[PDB]
Design a protein around this ligand. Structure first.
Ligand code: HEM
Ligand SMILES: Cc1ccc(O)c(C)c1
Length: 137
């Protein structure tokens, strides 16, 4: 289920983080309006860029902690308020998060592994709700 998937992802986190973020950017190319230094790069070139690997790993490190602190795929209000208040998220709306979790769920469905994709769909929907409640536009 969801808890085992956190452990699976954590066991190879930099590859999963990079591959899921690339699935997001490739499905939603307009989302590079928030990632201007990733324009004009293939996936293998992005994986060679220090902040791409570093920042994406740090994003997924925190995402896995928010998932681990959740109950039944519902994140803590304190985690939602952290993600709204972060200065690096000043430009963002809940639709940015919705698209990330659509891509993450599609990535899990396409894998041969027994990911609990429905739980990740719920977690994304519940994180978007918590972000909206905590004041993200
Ligand atoms: C649960 C989901 C998310 C988590 C846990 C998260 C967490 C983080 C963390 C930890 C950082 C700091 C990275 C660093 O400085 O090394 C960061 C920066 C950032 N996040 Fe988020 N984030 C999430 C979702 C999103 C989404 C959906 C977007 C936009 C589509 C986004 C856009 C950014 C941007 C633009 C930065 C700063 C630019 C950069 O670090 O390259 N984040 N995020
Ligand atoms: C959602 C997301 C994924 C990776 C990454 O580097 C940043 C900054 C955000």
């Amino acid at each position: 289920g969801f808890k085992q998937d956190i452990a699976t992802l954590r066991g190879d986190l930099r590859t999963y983080a990079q591959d899921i973020f690339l699935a997001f950017l490739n499905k939603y190319p307009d989302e590079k309006r928030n990632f201007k230094n990733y324009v004009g790069k293939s996936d293998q070139e992005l994986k060679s860029m220090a902040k791409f690997g570093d920042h994406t790993e740090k994003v997924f490190n925190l995402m896995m902690e928010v998932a681990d602190r959740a109950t039944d795929c519902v994140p803590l209000a304190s985690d939602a308020s952290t993600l709204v208040q972060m200065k690096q998220h000043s430009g963002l709306t809940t639709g940015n998060f919705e698209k990330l979790f659509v891509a993450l769920v599609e990535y899990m469905r396409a894998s041969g592994q027994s990911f609990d994709s429905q739980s990740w769909d719920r977690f994304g929907k519940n994180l978007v709700s918590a972000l909206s409640s905590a004041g993200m536009k």
